[PDB]
Amino acid sequence: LSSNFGAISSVLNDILSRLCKVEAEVQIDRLITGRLQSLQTYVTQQLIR
Amino acid sequence: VVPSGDVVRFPNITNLCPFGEVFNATKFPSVYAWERKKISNCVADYSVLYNSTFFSTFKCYGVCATKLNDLCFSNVYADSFVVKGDDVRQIAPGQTGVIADYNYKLPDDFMGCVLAWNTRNIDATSTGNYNYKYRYLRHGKLRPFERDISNVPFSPDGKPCTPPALNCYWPLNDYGFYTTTGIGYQPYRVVVLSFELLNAPATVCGPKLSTDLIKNQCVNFNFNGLTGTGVLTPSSKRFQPFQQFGR
Amino acid sequence: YNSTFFSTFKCYGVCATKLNDLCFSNVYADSFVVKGDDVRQIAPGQTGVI
Amino acid sequence: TQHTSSMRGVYYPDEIFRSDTLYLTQDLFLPFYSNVTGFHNPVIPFKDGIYFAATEKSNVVRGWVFGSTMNNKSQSVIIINNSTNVVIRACNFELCDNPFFMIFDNAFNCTFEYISDKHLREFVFKNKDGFLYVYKGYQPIDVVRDLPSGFNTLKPIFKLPLGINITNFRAILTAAAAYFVGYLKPTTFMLKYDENGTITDAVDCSQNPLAELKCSVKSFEIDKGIYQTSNFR
Numbered sequence: 012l013s014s015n016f017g018a019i020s021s022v023l024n025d026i027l028s029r030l031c032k033v034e035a036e037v038q039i040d041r042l043i044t045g046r047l048q049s050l051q052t053y054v055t056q057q058l059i060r
Numbered sequence: 061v062v063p064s065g066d067v068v069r070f071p072n073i074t075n076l077c078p079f080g081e082v083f084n085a086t087k088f089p090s091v092y093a094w095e096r097k098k099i100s101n102c103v104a105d106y107s108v109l110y111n112s113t114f115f116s117t118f119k120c121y122g123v124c125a126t127k128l129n130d131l132c133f134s135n136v137y138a139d140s141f142v143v144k145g146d147d148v149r150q151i152a153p154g155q156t157g158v159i160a161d162y163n164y165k166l167p168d169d170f171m172g173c174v175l176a177w178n179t180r181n182i183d184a185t186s187t188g189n190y191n192y193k194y195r196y197l198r199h200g201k202l203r204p205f206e207r208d209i210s211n212v213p214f215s216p217d218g219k220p221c222t223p224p225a226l227n228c229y230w231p232l233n234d235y236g237f238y239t240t241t242g243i244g245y246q247p248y249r250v251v252v253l254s255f256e257l258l259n260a261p262a263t264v265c266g267p268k269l270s271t272d273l274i275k276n277q278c279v280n281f282n283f284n285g286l287t288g289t290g291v292l293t294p295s296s297k298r299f300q301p302f303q304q305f306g307r
Numbered sequence: 308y309n310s311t312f313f314s315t316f317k318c319y320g321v322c323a324t325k326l327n328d329l330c331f332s333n334v335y336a337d338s339f340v341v342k343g344d345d346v347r348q349i350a351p352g353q354t355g356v357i
Numbered sequence: 358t359q360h361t362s363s364m365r366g367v368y369y370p371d372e373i374f375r376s377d378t379l380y381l382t383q384d385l386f387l388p389f390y391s392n393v394t395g396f397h398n399p400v401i402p403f404k405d406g407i408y409f410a411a412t413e414k415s416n417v418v419r420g421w422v423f424g425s426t427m428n429n430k431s432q433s434v435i436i437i438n439n440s441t442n443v444v445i446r447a448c449n450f451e452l453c454d455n456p457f458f459m460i461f462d463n464a465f466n467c468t469f470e471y472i473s474d475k476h477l478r479e480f481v482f483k484n485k486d487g488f489l490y491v492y493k494g495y496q497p498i499d500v501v502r503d504l505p506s507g508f509n510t511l512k513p514i515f516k517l518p519l520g521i522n523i524t525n526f527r528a529i530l531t532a533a534a535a536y537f538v539g540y541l542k543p544t545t546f547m548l549k550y551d552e553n554g555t556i557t558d559a560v561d562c563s564q565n566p567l568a569e570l571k572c573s574v575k576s577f578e579i580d581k582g583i584y585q586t587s588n589f590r
């Protein structure tokens with residue numbers, strides 16, 4: 012959860028404190044995609060085990 | 061559950077930032093010898109500038125302009141100089157030109173704001189104001205936030221020379237400022253504000269009102285611009301001195 | 308740097324600071340004259356008379 | 358003569374209060390078991406930042422001068438400590454041939470002023486982005502004629518907002534003690550942070566294959582067997 016995935020920061024509340032909506036959604040979507048694919052990796056490994 | 065509450069905590073700072081001292085000075089330096097001043101321990105209201113000073117250029121990198129009132133900055137430096145009208149577009153990251161190469165360079169990862177305004181009534185005379193200079197010859201470019209105020213004679217060979225010679229030039233040129241020229245040949249005063257966010261205790265901050273603490277309830281807190289949502293409990297953890305928050 | 312000063316200078320596809328270590332292949336120069344308010348129409352994705 | 362800097366010159370490259378953690382980075386650091394040059398005054402070059410160590414008892418060394426050409430044609434910064442106070446001054450000094458503990462003839466055209474109110478001193482000087490970072494640490498050494506083995510972290514004392522090149526520097530002596538200089542190189546280190554926010558252990562990933570294995574596994578304890586490592590060589 013501490014990876015920023017190419018965004019400006021890994022903390023979700025610091026991107027919303029110094030950015031505007033159009034420019035904040037672009038940064039938030041990278042974190043959303045990274046965490047979604049991390050959780051997908053976890054569930055696939057669990058299925059095989 | 062949906063949160064019902066709000067907590068705002070800010071440092072106890074009452075002074076106003078020296079807007080008049082920085083923006084309204086007697087005279088500004090040249091661009092090749094730009095001046096840096098540290099700013100601390102004040103409140104950046106900037107609402108007093110609405111009836112006095114009007115900026116042709118105001119652009120902010122790394123933050124939003126509408127978020128500057130609820131935010132709380134850590135270390136602020138102000139860089140002041142004077143350029144002409146057509147050089148104001150060179151005060152930006154990733155730019156080239158005489159000013160961006162030999163006089164003033166910005167980092168690519170720049171957080172701050174650039175604000176410039178026109179001053180023809182005070183910095184321009186009828187006979188000519190040949191007081192502001194800029195460097196147009198130099199062996200190589202400049203690193204960011206560095207200056208070179210030397211005035212040695214220049215020669216393309218790379219060796220010292222006495223400037224009554226043939227291939228020797230004085231590296232500085234004078235801005236010729238009149239009151240009867242175009243808009244691209246009029247004096248402009250530029251101030252670059254450089255700040256960093258969320259490292260240290262914040263000393264210059266914003267004009268927001270504080271609020272009493274609420275304990276043991278899911279409320280939206282705001283500690284020096286660090287917004288969030290959670291429940292607040294007393295602590296027994298010990299911190300290093302001058303360290304604000306931990307993760 | 309001591310003769311010509313450009314009101315407008317903007318580069319697409321490259322960075323302006325990378326133009327000294329770069330080596331180009333086929334260069335064409337297109338020259339014309341417009342008025343002051345048409346200079347913003349010389350850009351991709353623009354509309355207007357020009 | 359030449360000595361060896363054994364596990365010396367580790368500083369804080371950042372500022373966040375951090376509990377129990379390990380962090381891998383590449384940065385300008387001092388390589389482990391690398392050469393240092395000892396002096397028991399030449400114009401020593403300042404390439405990318407330096408580590409300066411002073412073994413002294415009577416405090417015969419007094420600050421430094423950093424500059425480009427050591428003339429009055431360029432800015433130079435002087436950081437000295439006289440009997441009462443420590444002063445930092447960035448001006449166009451007439452740099453004399455041999456300074457004493459009066460260093461400059463005149464001073465003109467200048468901006469930055471700052472006045473502030475056997476044993477070993479260690480300093481790290483790093484000039485970047487128009488700022489000069491100075492880190493300092495202290496050591497209660499016994500009698501020796503070499504830089505001792507050990508590991509001590511360096512506290513960041515102060516950064517100066519002065520925008521000049523620094524290609525040369527020169528120490529300033531009073532006219533028993535020795536000083537050693539080492540150069541910083543871009544290397545890969547891994548650091549461990551304890552439960553108080555301090556650095557307690559570090560390793561250089563380019564020194565030994567065992568250290569490269571530690572950097573690849575990202576731990577200090579490894580078990581019996583065979584592993585595959587990355588390229589930190």
Ligand SMILES: C=CC1=C(C)/C(=C/c2[nH]c(/C=C3N=C(/C=C4\NC(=O)C(C)=C4C=C)C(C)=C\3CCC(=O)O)c(CCC(=O)O)c2C)NC1=O
Pocket residue numbers: 411416417418419420421436437438443478493514
């Ligand atoms: C000019 C650079 C320089 C810097 C940046 C510096 C930092 C520095 N050294 C200190 C201790 C101190 N440091 C010194 C002396 C020295 N320290 C040296 O690096 C050298 C070469 C001498 C020799 C003159 C002294 C006399 C004290 C006061 C405590 C003591 O007696 O050691 C202190 C006060 C620490 C405290 O009171 O808690 C600071 C801020 N000292 C310096 O001299």
Ligand SMILES: *[C@@H]1O[C@H](CO)[C@@H](O[C@@H]2O[C@H](CO)[C@@H](O)[C@H](O)[C@H]2NC(C)=O)[C@H](O)[C@H]1NC(C)=O
Pocket residue numbers: 199200201202203206218425426522523524
């Ligand atoms: C800081 O000073 C050094 C030395 O004065 C500068 O290095 C010179 O760079 C030019 C550029 O081509 C060379 O022709 C000189 O030979 C260099 N000098 C030496 C002694 O090697 C350096 O450029 C200065 N810093 C900046 C940012 O300009």
Ligand SMILES: CCCCC/C=C/C/C=C/CCCCCCCC(=O)O
Pocket residue numbers: 156157158308312313316326331334336
């Ligand atoms: C006409 C020959 C064309 C050669 C091919 C072009 C290569 C790239 C160079 C373009 C010239 C840019 C000049 C503007 C920058 C300096 C002027 C300034 O901003 O101060």
Ligand SMILES: CCCCC/C=C/C/C=C/CCCCCCCC(=O)O
Pocket residue numbers: 354355356
């Ligand atoms: C007033 C009626 C509004 C109708 C709804 C709008 C539709 C989109 C059209 C907008 C008009 C753009 C005019 C500017 C472009 C031509 C002028 C120029 O650049 O040379």
Ligand SMILES: *[C@@H]1O[C@H](CO)[C@@H](O)[C@H](O)[C@H]1NC(C)=O
Pocket residue numbers: 111112
């Ligand atoms: C703003 O400036 C004008 C300039 O004349 C002045 O008259 C006015 O009083 C100022 N506003 C306030 C609130 O002082």
Ligand SMILES: *[C@@H]1O[C@H](CO)[C@@H](O)[C@H](O)[C@H]1NC(C)=O
Pocket residue numbers: 229309310
């Ligand atoms: C640049 O142009 C000015 C215009 O007068 C000229 O005087 C100067 O010599 C030129 N620079 C060089 C290096 O020739």
Ligand SMILES: *[C@@H]1O[C@H](CO)[C@@H](O)[C@H](O)[C@H]1NC(C)=O
Pocket residue numbers: 359360361392
């Ligand atoms: C310093 O490095 C050289 C290699 O350039 C090496 O030969 C020498 O032994 C080193 N010095 C010491 C004291 O080991």
Ligand SMILES: *[C@@H]1O[C@H](CO)[C@@H](O)[C@H](O)[C@H]1NC(C)=O
Pocket residue numbers: 429430451463465
């Ligand atoms: C700089 O030093 C030279 C001698 O090296 C001297 O002649 C000159 O006057 C000095 N400059 C100033 C401004 O004093």
Ligand SMILES: *[C@@H]1O[C@H](CO)[C@@H](O)[C@H](O)[C@H]1NC(C)=O
Pocket residue numbers: 439440441442444
């Ligand atoms: C040390 O130098 C500063 C620099 O001007 C001076 O103000 C101070 O009096 C000096 N102290 C002593 C003891 O010489």
Ligand SMILES: *[C@@H]1O[C@H](CO)[C@@H](O)[C@H](O)[C@H]1NC(C)=O
Pocket residue numbers: 093209465466467
């Ligand atoms: C430097 O000093 C000279 C005289 O010694 C003066 O003419 C010049 O304006 C000064 N420049 C700056 C940037 O102070």
Ligand SMILES: *[C@@H]1O[C@H](CO)[C@@H](O)[C@H](O)[C@H]1NC(C)=O
Pocket residue numbers: 552553
């Ligand atoms: C460091 O942290 C531990 C555990 O939180 C604590 O017991 C100790 O007092 C702290 N300080 C020091 C100096 O060890």
